[PDB]
Amino acid sequence: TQVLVMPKAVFESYKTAGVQFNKLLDTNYIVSETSVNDLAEIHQALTAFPFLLPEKLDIKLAVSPIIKVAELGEIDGPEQFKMKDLHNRLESRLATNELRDAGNRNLVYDYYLYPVDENLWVAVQQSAHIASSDPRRVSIQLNHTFFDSMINEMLNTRPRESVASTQIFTYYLESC
Amino acid sequence: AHRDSNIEAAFRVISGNQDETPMYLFCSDKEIANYLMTKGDDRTLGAYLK
Amino acid sequence: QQLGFELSRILKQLPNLGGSDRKTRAMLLANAVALQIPFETLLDFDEQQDKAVAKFKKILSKVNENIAVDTKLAVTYFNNILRIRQSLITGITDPCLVKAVLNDYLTVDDVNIVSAVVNGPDYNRIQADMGNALNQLIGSID
Amino acid sequence: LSRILKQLPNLGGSDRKTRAMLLANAVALQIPFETLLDFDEQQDKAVAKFKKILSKVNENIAVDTKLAVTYFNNILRIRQSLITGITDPCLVKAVLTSDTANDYLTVDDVNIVSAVVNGPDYNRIQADMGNALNQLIGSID
Amino acid sequence: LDHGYDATALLETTEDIITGELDDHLESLSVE
Amino acid sequence: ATIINTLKTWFEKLMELFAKLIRWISDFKKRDVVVATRYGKIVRAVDQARTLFQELLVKNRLGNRKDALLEKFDAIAQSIIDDPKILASRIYAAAFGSVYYQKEIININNEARTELGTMEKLVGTIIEYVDYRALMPIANIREIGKLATRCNELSTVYPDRSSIPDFPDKNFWKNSHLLKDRFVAPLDDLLKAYRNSSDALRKLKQLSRNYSQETIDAIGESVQLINTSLEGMRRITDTMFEYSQAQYLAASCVLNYYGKCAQVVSEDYKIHGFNDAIREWQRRFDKVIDDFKRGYA
Amino acid sequence: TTKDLPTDPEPGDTYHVNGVDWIYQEDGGWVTMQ
């Protein structure tokens, strides 16, 4: 599968508006149903995801929409230049956000897993918590219900013995 | 007639210009000429011929 | 005059086309209410959104006693407009707003046009460079 | 500093005016207004810091410092109106169809906003809803 | 009623209609 | 008497209506002067750029890359015509090349310039009163209502462009020649007509004398007609001004189309093997861009 | 001047005014050939 981290604000928009979650990995669909700021915030939320996913089980972290847009802007086609214009807007909006939320600094997020098919693992970035001393341990303890949600879902397809050897399984044990 | 005559090749080999195509001159009288001359800006044939 | 009836009476005055009517009807309610509700000073955005939406939904419940509005679509618009409002109060204020409220004549389009012709940075990219090139100064001082 | 300032195309006699706007936004982005206070103490602090920042305009090329303060003060007052809430169609239009609003709205959402906001009777209808809400928003529990 | 059942008083005054139209037009300009 | 107060109240209301409109039209004139100065620069650049491409393509100087570059050019146009700044109203459809809508807008403009003379005559009629009932120019009043009605129809923005038939698609630069003749709103005529009308009413402050009922009835009709005319012309003027702004945007969009197309030619033959004609063409195009930039500067 | 074109023409019609050639395409209406 592929984990797609998005802020709660973006997730609730998708659920309220009724945006097909299946096609959020297809660049051509997400850019039509997603605002420029939402796309930038998804990038920022991916870059703030602290956990290492079980690559040994073919569980990858999604490539941010900005990179996908940047790549398509360099590939010949009938929409290439519209995609380049979108890229420029994403960079300016992303820089605008980075200059505003730079003060966030020392905090960690709660994550909620919303499985969508076997090729997409929506990870909702919820309320922040302040964590300056050993934020790695604080993040682990806070995300207990995120770790067991991931374990429950990958045990649907992956062998139990293999999942038991992942860092995600370990994080669950360390939390409780 | 343009295809079968192989005329375009003859012009290119003789002139040396590999992007040259013959121009077809319509030799009419005074009455027919008034019907051949139309939207003169597009004074071209089916495709690349003039 | 219950709010549900007064808002419905006004919404009836929008021009009609066909089924597109529910998208423009919902949008106008989202625009008016998202921008009209005052913010409480003690709340952060997270709490202000939950409170503002709770009232917005209650308003729709009263409006839907008089005129049909798609609830889920209106909330979608409401949250988007509310986030824009929250961004403006904490974030960057567009120069069109300074211009609209306040000798201001040359507009942003006027410079974005030149940048587009020369294929250089536009106003927003320059604005991003300004703040970035200023980040160190503001952080250093107080 | 000057590297990026030289990226702004020259436009008539406005070179000193557009950069004044750019600087006012650049500072106002990173000095927030704490919602806890009213428009006197947090306002004076934000303005005082802005004027102190203007002390370094000798590093810049074309900054009208008197206008830059005017723009900065306008930003703070506009934020006050937005915190308290706005209904005036002349300002609501400016917010709904703007460079910020086009980044939070999708292409289809903008198309809808552009259909309502640019209607022949928008200003009248929007004003009427502003009064319908301002008078009764408190009635909603 | 508002004023009274006399059919003559029920009739709206033309001068008041002209003033009203002027007031409604000016109100719209204040809104716009 | 109460008649004098009624007349004076109406006159103040009319002058207040003009005072609000005059300020609005002055703001329009100030903005239009800025736009007109920049619009001249844009059109010159578009005419020069259009000629350069006409030469570039008609001589087949691109060679085998012609087809590929043309596809890119279409992609550029598609990215510009879909710019959300371009509203779905027929006003912008006309500004971006549509012919039927443009003709209607021009006809409306030309008619408004003549109906303004009627507005002056209505006010002059009031001066002649303050039985002499003028025959009244209610005719042109029917027409200004129809023109304002059509202006509202044109300016309406639909949720989707598909609601407008023959809306300009990516092929909006092909009709850029229609932008040569700048569209000018009758802003100067409005200011003259409104300022003269306001001053004429200002000179009636001293009324005095009891008036006959037939004089007051005739004045009442004139006041009502003027009120309707002012609202009608306001609707028309705003729509005609919107087209002026739309045409400015359309001219900028065509210039941006040509600018981006030239950039693709430069990049394409910097990656591939450039010819001498290509470098000569690009230098000519760069001169056009430089003149444009210097004009704005 | 170049807006003297016939109203309601057939699709695919071509009409020449003032050195400008106009094709009446079904989608875009009147558009110059080049």
Are the Cβ atoms of A92 and C125 closer than 8 angstroms? yes
Structure tokens at C62: 């009263």
Q: What is the DSSP string of D81-107?
A: HHHH----HHHHHHHHSSTTHHHHS-H
Q: How many CB atoms lie within 10 A of CB F67?
A: 8
Q: Are strands A120-130 and G14-17 parallel, antiparallel or unpaired?
A: unpaired
For residue C45, what is the enclosing H or E element? helix C45-63
- Contacts with B40 from chain G: Cβ below 8 Å: 16
Interface contact C118, partner D, CB < 8 A: yes
Interface contact A32, partner F, CB < 8 A: no
CA distance C130 to chain D (A): 6
CA distance F255 to chain C (A): 7
Looking at residue F212, the DSSP 8-state letter turns out to be P
Structure tokens at F70: 């043309």
How many alpha carbons lie under 13 Å from residue C100 in its C-beta half-sphere?
A: 17
- State how far the Cα of C121 lies from the Cα of D54, in Å rounded to an integer: 25
Q: How far is CA D101 from CA D94, D98, F72, F194, F242, in A?
A: 10, 5, 30, 37, 21
Task: Tell me the torsion sign for CA atoms A130, A131, A136, A138.
Answer: negative
Structure tokens at F63: 């060679």
For residue A115, what is the enclosing H or E element? strand A107-116
Closest to D120 in 3D by CA, of A137, G33, F236? F236
Resolution of the solved structure (Å):
3.5
CB contact at 8 A, C27 and C76: no
**Can you give the C-alpha Rg of chain E in angstroms?**
13
Strand partners for E5: none
Cα angle F125, F131, F134 (rounded to 5 degrees) comes to: 30
For residue A155, what is the enclosing H or E element? none
CB contact at 8 A, F111 and F183: no
Strand partners for A106: none
CB contact at 8 A, C124 and C108: no
Are the Cβ atoms of F256 and C116 closer than 8 angstroms? yes
- Contacts with F87 from chain D: Cβ below 8 Å: 114, 118
Q: How far is CA A151 from CA A21, A124, A139, A140, in A?
A: 21, 16, 17, 14
This entry's atomic model was obtained through cryo-EM
Looking at residue A122, the DSSP 8-state letter turns out to be E
Structure tokens at A27: 């660049």
Interface contact A33, partner C, CB < 8 A: no
Task: Name the closest residue on chain B to residue G14, using Cα atoms.
Answer: B39
End-to-end CA distance of chain D: 52
Structure tokens at C55: 């009232």
Are the Cβ atoms of D11 and F160 closer than 8 angstroms? no
Are the Cβ atoms of F6 and E15 closer than 8 angstroms? yes
Structure tokens at A58: 């073919």
Task: Name the closest residue on chain A to residue C46, using Cα atoms.
Answer: A127
- State how far the Cα of D94 lies from the Cα of D126, in Å rounded to an integer: 13
- State how far the Cα of E17 lies from the Cα of E3, in Å rounded to an integer: 17
Task: Name the closest residue on chain D to residue A102, using Cα atoms.
Answer: D30
- Contacts with F296 from chain C: Cβ below 8 Å: 110, 114
DSSP E strand boundaries for F22-174: none
Q: Which chains touch A (3 or more CB pairs under 8 A)?
A: C, D, F
Sequence letter at residue C119: N
CA distance F132 to chain C (A): 43
Structure tokens at B13: 């080999």
Given G5, G27, G34, which is nearest F99 (Cβ)?
G5
Are the Cβ atoms of A34 and D106 closer than 8 angstroms? yes
Given F54, F106, F168, which is nearest G28 (Cβ)?
F168
Q: Are strands A107-116 and A120-130 parallel, antiparallel or unpaired?
A: antiparallel
Given F30, F163, F293, which is nearest C105 (Cβ)?
F30
Sequence letter at residue F233: M
> Given its phi and psi angles, is residue A6 left (phi above 0), alpha (psi -120 to 50 degrees) or beta?
beta
Burial level of F58, CB count in 10 A (0-12/13-18/19+)?
exposed
Task: Name the closest residue on chain F to residue E27, using Cα atoms.
Answer: F17
Q: How far is CA F37 from CA F30, F42, F44, in A?
A: 11, 9, 12
Interface contact D131, partner E, CB < 8 A: no
Looking at residue A65, the DSSP 8-state letter turns out to be H
CB contact at 8 A, A126 and A76: no
How many alpha carbons lie under 13 Å from residue F2 in its C-beta half-sphere?
A: 3
Interface contact A35, partner F, CB < 8 A: no
Interface test with A, best of C80, C86, C142 (most A CBs within 10 A): C80
Looking at residue C2, the DSSP 8-state letter turns out to be -
Interface contact A129, partner C, CB < 8 A: no
- Contacts with C122 from chain D: Cβ below 8 Å: none
Interface contact A35, partner C, CB < 8 A: yes
- Contacts with F225 from chain E: Cβ below 8 Å: none
- CA C98 and chain centroid, separation: 16
- Contacts with D89 from chain E: Cβ below 8 Å: 31-32
